[PDB]
Amino acid sequence: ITPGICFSTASLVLRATDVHPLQRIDMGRFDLIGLEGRVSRYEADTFLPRHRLSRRVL
Amino acid sequence: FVMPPVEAPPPSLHACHPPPWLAPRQAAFQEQLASELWPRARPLHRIV
Amino acid sequence: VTRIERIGAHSHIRGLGLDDALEPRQASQGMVGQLAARRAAGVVLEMIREGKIAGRAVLIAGQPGTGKTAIAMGMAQALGPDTPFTAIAGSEIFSLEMSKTEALTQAFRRSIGVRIKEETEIIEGEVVEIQIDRPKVGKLTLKTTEMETIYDLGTKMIESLTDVITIDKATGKIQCPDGELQKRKEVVHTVSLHEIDVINSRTQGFLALFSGDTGEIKSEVREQINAKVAEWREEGKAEIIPGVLFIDEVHMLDIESFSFLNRALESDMAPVLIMATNRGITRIRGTSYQSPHGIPIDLLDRLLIVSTTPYSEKDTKQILRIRCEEEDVEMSEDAYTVLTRIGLETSLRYAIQLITAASLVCRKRKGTEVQVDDIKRVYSLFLDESRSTQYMKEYQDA
Amino acid sequence: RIERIGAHSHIRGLGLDDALEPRQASQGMVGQLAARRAAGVVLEMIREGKIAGRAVLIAGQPGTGKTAIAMGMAQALGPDTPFTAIAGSEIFSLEMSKTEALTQAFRRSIGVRIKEETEIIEGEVVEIQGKLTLKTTEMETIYDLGTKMIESLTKDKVQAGDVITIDKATGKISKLGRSFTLQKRKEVVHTVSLHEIDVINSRTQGFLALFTGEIKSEVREQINAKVAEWREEGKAEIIPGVLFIDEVHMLDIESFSFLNRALESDMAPVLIMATNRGITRIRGTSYQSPHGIPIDLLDRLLIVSTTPYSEKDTKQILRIRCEEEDVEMSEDAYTVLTRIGLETSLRYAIQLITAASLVCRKRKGTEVQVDDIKRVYSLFLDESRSTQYMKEYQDA
Amino acid sequence: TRIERIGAHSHIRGLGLDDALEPRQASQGMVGQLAARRAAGVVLEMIREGKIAGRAVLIAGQPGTGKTAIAMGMAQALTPFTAIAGSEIFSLEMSKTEALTQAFRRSIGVRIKEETEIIEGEVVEIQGKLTLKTTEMETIYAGDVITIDKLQKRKEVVHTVSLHEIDVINSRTQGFLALFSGDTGEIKSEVREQINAKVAEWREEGKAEIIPGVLFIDEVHMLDIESFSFLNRALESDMAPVLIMATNRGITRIRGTSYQSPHGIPIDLLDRLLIVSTTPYSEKDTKQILRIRCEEEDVEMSEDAYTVLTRIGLETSLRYAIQLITAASLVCRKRKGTEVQVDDIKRVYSLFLDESRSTQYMKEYQ
Amino acid sequence: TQRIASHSHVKGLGLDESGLAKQAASGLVGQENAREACGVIVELIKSKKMAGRAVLLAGPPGTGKTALALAIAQELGSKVPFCPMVGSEVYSTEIKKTEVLMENFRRAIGLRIKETKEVYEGEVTVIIGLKTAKGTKQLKLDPSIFEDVIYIEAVKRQGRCDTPKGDVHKKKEIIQDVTLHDLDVANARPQKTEITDKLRGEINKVVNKYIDQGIAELVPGVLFVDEVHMLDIECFTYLHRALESSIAPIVIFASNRGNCVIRGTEDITSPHGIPLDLLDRVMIIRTMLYTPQEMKQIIKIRAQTEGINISEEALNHLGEIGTKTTLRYSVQLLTPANLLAKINGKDSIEKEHVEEISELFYDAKSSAKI
Amino acid sequence: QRIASHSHVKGLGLDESGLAKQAASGLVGQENAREACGVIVELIKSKKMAGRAVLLAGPPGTGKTALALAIAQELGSKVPFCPMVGSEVYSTEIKKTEVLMENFRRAIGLRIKETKEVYEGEVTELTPCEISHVIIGLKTAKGTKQLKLDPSIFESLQKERVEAGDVIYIEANSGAVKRQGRCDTYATEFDLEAEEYVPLPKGDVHKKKEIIQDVTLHDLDVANARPTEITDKLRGEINKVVNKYIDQGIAELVPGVLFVDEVHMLDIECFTYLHRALESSIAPIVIFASNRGNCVIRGTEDITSPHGIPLDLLDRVMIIRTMLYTPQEMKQIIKIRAQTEGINISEEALNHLGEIGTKTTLRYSVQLLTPANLLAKINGKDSIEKEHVEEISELFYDAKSSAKI
């Protein structure tokens, strides 16, 4: 015997609370990585496209 | 030789139940189906 | 023929007899007796149905066997539909998996209810073997006894089709009166604060119908949920309804639940709860210090004690008459006198246990009236608590 | 096969005759007439296959051999019959309950013999790339293979010439095939233990039947119903087994009340209870009781007391320990060894014999010197000497 | 306004001693306690040398001598330090043996020198042939970043890793158990033998080295006998960090048993503790440490107020007199004055009270 | 024949049609007041109208209340469920203390369900043509089932070998009996603690929907509860709410000791280990005291039932040794005396055989004297 | 408005000079305790002192919970206030030390107002024509725009149903929340598409929204531990990243304030972790409350200590005395409930209710104030008379009359 119980009804107020536009995070903290010394290389790789895109616009 | 050991199952069995929706729902309603479609190849070949 | 809800011990009553001027009667809605308890129950019921204050404890107590649980049963029967009534005991919160504080705040979550008014559209009709396949909408014709409708189908509705098929606004579901299919519906639905469990973890149905969850996530369930249910408050949307909690066996409960009840009633979302107490002076558990009532002063100052009086000769025979009216087999007037003398000398539940056996002896007799010798033989064969005390002089084991 | 002989493995069986009379020099067990007489009665009652479920307790002084008689019953019990020795302290678990462990102890000692029929053909295999040819003593026959037999031969690294057995269920047997580098009925009666209740409840069978509360509700009932159905259709009978309970006086009264009603069922095997001391209070209550056991369990069981040892019986046990451990003794050391063993325990005398044999084989001599065993006895102390020589007040 | 600004007795930086290990009367640290700070300097030099193992030092005295300040001074003057309480090892998922073992093994540090060869950068190919979006070099043998381990660089990395390699060997992945406590009682042979063999091979190959740690266990007046039986082997083990026990109560009955012993310890741990007793503060020492603590939150006092504050702190507790200047600075700020008075500290003493004031006034018992 | 059954001498209660309790009837000879008390209880169970009543049994240890409950369970048969439980079974480590007494009232109540189902007996061909001895029919088959008869409810392979007659579609009426706790476990475990809103709310409503019309049939059960004098006071607290319910079936309690101390308070004494609030809510049944004539009669009936014919002198010895120390010792003297008679070759048992067996085995009072 | 048990608390009434008014925000009494709690709320608002402890010593039934609520209302919503019941510590699966430490982490919080631009999705710009380069337009009620997005966002796009008429919310960290069925999809007046029918999302493309948000560190620990914390690796990493966030100039730390009730009913191991963990330099301020007096500390069975607090815990804690009152102001306090209730009372019924309040306790009269107004509403009286209160004093009994009977 595989009997069937009818589905328990719910309301529309329940799930639509935990959510909204945005603004609830900070940064990716739990992401293991090394780059011991390459920090300045990623710094240079962030400073250079500023000047690159400014030369592309102007 | 598991032939005689496993006898008849208990005579009652139910299934799962998705609760109804009468409002706006297309988000999780379509990522829960995707997250159920992720384990269709992973429980394959279990030798049982 | 056979149903689940049978005639039990406290199931013979069908509500609580109250009036507009709060004047109790001698026999109203099954409950007979306890006038001051009737007035106190009417005052606390009108105070709960008013719904202004929140976080109040009203205790009732007295001698064991005066029909104190039946007063709360009549309050719960005459409470009304669409109102959550939670009846817990002093032993339900004791669990080796979850904590007693988590179980008590889960009962507090079960107490307060939310009434939500919505309007849906439900389409009904009979399906006549349609939708020629993929080369994939096809058609759909429904038939009624007034007018038929002929039209096409949709795209994503082909999965449910793989007999009246009632489909809501959502994906789908599973003689007939007629009308337009675009029936619009209002569904006043009652939620027993299940908004926490639906987002607290995934697969909310297996955690909502049966338990297995741990202690709920702190700093997410008490401030955020309260702020959001305040956001759904006073904007034309749903409004909360404080339910009725009924607690049993408080005088043998731990002191930690007492300390939690000392500060749980002072919160904002605190339902009006009532509790029962049977024994008198009983030492509290956890410590070796004796105290009256089984409850310390720090909680007795936060509640009100309503004492109950025992029954008399005139009320006991009225209870016997209304239980004979509830049952089928009648008795003889001398047997009513003997049963009244038994109910006066002994407890009332002992007479309830005797009258069912007397009705079964009358069914063995295949008659409609219990005689005197039948209930005399039932009283002779069946012993009592005060009767079997003198038979324990043999010193059989210790 | 290298297993050291323990303190209870020095005997082989129990002394039994046609009239069931206890002997003195029979199979290493000396004396103890009435307790071994009752042990022979209940051993014949077990081996007859008539009833099971009577609670027998063995009481007496500490050191009379209350444990070795259980090993003598278990060795003389016979092969293909389960024996399980459990103390009180094993079922004190924090993961499972006491009653569930006692039901495991009860259902473990019930063996089920199941008969099966197969066919096994033995002969020389010649493979032709394919088909096979069996060269046997009876006939030399070429067989044509189907579909699953060729697959079963190709999944394994099958070498031609070895013995390949073809069963009804097509199960290969590779026994002694790499040592150099119709047969109608083989009735196999296999013995299983009834630990398959969680196999009914749960789904896994590999990790489950080897090393877990298992749906008590209606799990044992269906197993007992199918056991009753097998008992009819004479396909499966049932033999009992012996469950020894060691030092039951250290057990709670709740397990006692559970055993008072779990013994009345038909699935209750024979159990032999051990109790050492006399007046001992029950752990859990405040009232005293004889044998550490309340009146309810005392009405259920029977008590057999052990007679203390005599002088000649002690000398014969020391002679058995002399002839068993390959220790050649002198004739002047038996009186001194009996004088030591009379004032102390017998196992301390066994340890004295063992240490004297160690010192004598360090000397590499054949005979045991009286001065040697005197020096070994003077090297160590006793329990009364541990009471006496600690009078210096070393601690608080 | 950063996270730690001021708390309990921790304002001094480092510990203050000399070349002859003699404390001064006006220097860094506290004022007084010559023998206690001298023995603390001796055992801290023993920690800095690291010759033997199994050094358990007990500190005792009257309540109010500041053992926590001495522990923080030895921590700042110190290498992995760890200060635990008496209830952190008392857990429910773990036992009283595994949690104390994990508290012991956490202070041990390992310095690892690892030299790797890394060829990193941006792609400029696909389909096999490797070049860059370079500044420097070419010669094959778009936009994504690929790093290949054996431009080309031999990088040397120093790692300071605790013994939580035992956490990562038993685990399957390194993401789950590296953020919380972990599992139940694991294979102790895997903890002892394989770890000791692989660290011995790392010592023989000269790749990594080990350093011990310090564990400060405060309030050891209450402790179950399971830990006292565990410390018989823990102090007599092959390797163990140094332990500093702090016991405040003199005679206290051990919970679970019924005995009368000093410091709540049995005879087995009695001869295993280097016991250092203290001395309560005098008039000049209390006045000088009040002069030190006036420089904490930049609070100046009048001349006639130090005598009143020391007179209150002598009869009552010292920490009450430390809190009096904080409770009076707000009243002085609301007064709009740059100097406190006698009436201010008398008003603060009338507002806030101590145990000696509340002892007499609780005679109601209603 | 399965000889192991302990209390065995029972055919029923032995109650006559006129209400009188016959003495020499149905094996259990004696205890007339208990049989006349349980004659009302079996009518209460059979009528299926009133439920939620407690029957407490009291007396000395060894009056046969377990045989009385077995007689009630054999009068009711296999139709009415019978759930035995002792007081030590409710205690566990991972299972909470208030879980077994909650699930006893669900495992006691049964429901008869009659369902009509189909079987497709197709042989060989996702489109699977089911070949029978009548014809071939194609069916649309689900993508879930990939790997003779099948299981069509909501896939057994093979079944034959020639390289199975019947129609393509069939029907059959399966009639089974399912308990409510099996329904609860199937709800909790798809293809343990039960949450209240499902166990009380939805399951009762769907069982009403099955009874709702013709289909099923509700049958109450009998819950036998032994070892109540050493049960925890929190279980008593839950039992007070259990008796104050209309959905609870009949529960028969059994008490053993005379007076005890309630586990949980450990200071107050109480008769039969039960507090006054629970002892007021039970029906007291008291057993009688044995006589040596009825003792010799029941020993003779047990011996004639099992396997043994005994002469008069050994029956007198059994009656004397049962009058002195223990009735169950006289029960246990039957089988070793038969074994001694089989060893010596005697077809019966004389006085010397039971004398030697009583010399070998000891008593409880005799062990207390030593 | 659903008024709770006590709603008199709206302030504490402290002036600039530092005096205590006689009647301010319904908190009549204890001017010495008023100044003593003004000092500690000034210590909280000064943001310089962390690691202190406050005990409120008094008889049972004075109303120190209202004083702590007045502290919380003077602080308001800036300072996080999380009260803890003493029965919230005795957990079954989580140890008590971790519960107290997580409460200490619930105390400490920060505030780092920031920004976040919204994108909101066009209707149909499924253009995978490069995968590195995806062109997605936007059709809002204000108008239409276009944007180029790197391949990812698109990898989140093919995971969900991207059809004709959908919503695409794109966050700053590639957080995509999508819907289906918008604008218009009523082509041939056909059946259900089974989607969400929403009207036009009025609003422009480029807003610049600014939100001040208070973030607790325990929510941060829960969000970072999952995809009992280690006190060598996890919380030190949290301390380092909060130090970096406040040195770069992003977040602003606020002090932590806790309030614990029934402190003496805790275990002694909770005490020896409590007065060890408040000795840290990062410890928040916790106002402790002792309910009853001289009893036995839990776990000792022989040690006698006042207020159920050991000698190591009773030290280094400020103590504020809260004594009893005078009866002649009790009828004032009832009046404070009357303006809270909204129904005016008479003059003689106030006298009888004050007599009942000075008979046994004030809380009995406060609880009997509600059925007096209830029977006044039932019988039809616009005010509470003396007959209703003299009847409800005899109908409902206290604990003293229950112990007398």
PDB file of N, CA, C and O in Angstrom, chain E residues 266-281:
ATOM      1  N   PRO E 266      45.634  16.423  43.707  1.00  0.00           N
ATOM      2  CA  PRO E 266      46.104  15.230  44.424  1.00  0.00           C
ATOM      3  C   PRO E 266      47.602  15.245  44.688  1.00  0.00           C
ATOM      4  O   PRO E 266      48.289  16.238  44.430  1.00  0.00           O
ATOM      5  N   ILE E 267      48.114  14.125  45.204  1.00  0.00           N
ATOM      6  CA  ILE E 267      49.532  14.013  45.527  1.00  0.00           C
ATOM      7  C   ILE E 267      50.364  13.869  44.252  1.00  0.00           C
ATOM      8  O   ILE E 267      51.539  14.262  44.216  1.00  0.00           O
ATOM      9  N   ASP E 268      49.759  13.356  43.174  1.00  0.00           N
ATOM     10  CA  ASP E 268      50.497  13.095  41.939  1.00  0.00           C
ATOM     11  C   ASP E 268      50.901  14.388  41.235  1.00  0.00           C
ATOM     12  O   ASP E 268      52.008  14.485  40.694  1.00  0.00           O
ATOM     13  N   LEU E 269      50.023  15.388  41.231  1.00  0.00           N
ATOM     14  CA  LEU E 269      50.339  16.688  40.657  1.00  0.00           C
ATOM     15  C   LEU E 269      50.929  17.639  41.698  1.00  0.00           C
ATOM     16  O   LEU E 269      51.314  18.764  41.358  1.00  0.00           O
ATOM     17  N   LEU E 270      51.046  17.190  42.952  1.00  0.00           N
ATOM     18  CA  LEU E 270      51.526  18.055  44.026  1.00  0.00           C
ATOM     19  C   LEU E 270      53.010  18.374  43.887  1.00  0.00           C
ATOM     20  O   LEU E 270      53.405  19.537  44.022  1.00  0.00           O
ATOM     21  N   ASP E 271      53.839  17.371  43.604  1.00  0.00           N
ATOM     22  CA  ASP E 271      55.277  17.562  43.473  1.00  0.00           C
ATOM     23  C   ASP E 271      55.699  17.924  42.054  1.00  0.00           C
ATOM     24  O   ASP E 271      56.899  17.937  41.761  1.00  0.00           O
ATOM     25  N   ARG E 272      54.747  18.228  41.172  1.00  0.00           N
ATOM     26  CA  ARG E 272      55.037  18.549  39.780  1.00  0.00           C
ATOM     27  C   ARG E 272      54.784  20.018  39.455  1.00  0.00           C
ATOM     28  O   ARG E 272      54.733  20.386  38.278  1.00  0.00           O
ATOM     29  N   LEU E 273      54.631  20.865  40.470  1.00  0.00           N
ATOM     30  CA  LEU E 273      54.285  22.267  40.269  1.00  0.00           C
ATOM     31  C   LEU E 273      55.321  23.148  40.949  1.00  0.00           C
ATOM     32  O   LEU E 273      55.488  23.083  42.171  1.00  0.00           O
ATOM     33  N   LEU E 274      56.012  23.966  40.158  1.00  0.00           N
ATOM     34  CA  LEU E 274      56.885  25.008  40.695  1.00  0.00           C
ATOM     35  C   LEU E 274      55.989  26.108  41.251  1.00  0.00           C
ATOM     36  O   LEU E 274      55.428  26.902  40.498  1.00  0.00           O
ATOM     37  N   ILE E 275      55.828  26.141  42.571  1.00  0.00           N
ATOM     38  CA  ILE E 275      54.828  26.990  43.211  1.00  0.00           C
ATOM     39  C   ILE E 275      55.457  28.331  43.569  1.00  0.00           C
ATOM     40  O   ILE E 275      56.475  28.386  44.266  1.00  0.00           O
ATOM     41  N   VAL E 276      54.845  29.414  43.089  1.00  0.00           N
ATOM     42  CA  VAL E 276      55.274  30.776  43.388  1.00  0.00           C
ATOM     43  C   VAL E 276      54.124  31.492  44.081  1.00  0.00           C
ATOM     44  O   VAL E 276      53.039  31.643  43.504  1.00  0.00           O
ATOM     45  N   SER E 277      54.361  31.936  45.312  1.00  0.00           N
ATOM     46  CA  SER E 277      53.401  32.721  46.071  1.00  0.00           C
ATOM     47  C   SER E 277      53.726  34.206  45.953  1.00  0.00           C
ATOM     48  O   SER E 277      54.861  34.599  45.671  1.00  0.00           O
ATOM     49  N   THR E 278      52.710  35.034  46.176  1.00  0.00           N
ATOM     50  CA  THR E 278      52.820  36.476  46.014  1.00  0.00           C
ATOM     51  C   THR E 278      52.693  37.180  47.364  1.00  0.00           C
ATOM     52  O   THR E 278      52.606  36.554  48.422  1.00  0.00           O
ATOM     53  N   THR E 279      52.685  38.513  47.303  1.00  0.00           N
ATOM     54  CA  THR E 279      52.646  39.383  48.467  1.00  0.00           C
ATOM     55  C   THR E 279      51.660  40.503  48.143  1.00  0.00           C
ATOM     56  O   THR E 279      51.721  41.070  47.037  1.00  0.00           O
ATOM     57  N   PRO E 280      50.733  40.824  49.047  1.00  0.00           N
ATOM     58  CA  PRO E 280      49.804  41.931  48.787  1.00  0.00           C
ATOM     59  C   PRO E 280      50.511  43.279  48.781  1.00  0.00           C
ATOM     60  O   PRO E 280      51.580  43.463  49.369  1.00  0.00           O
ATOM     61  N   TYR E 281      49.889  44.230  48.089  1.00  0.00           N
ATOM     62  CA  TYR E 281      50.517  45.519  47.834  1.00  0.00           C
ATOM     63  C   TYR E 281      50.527  46.391  49.085  1.00  0.00           C
ATOM     64  O   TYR E 281      49.643  46.307  49.942  1.00  0.00           O
TER      65      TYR E 281
END
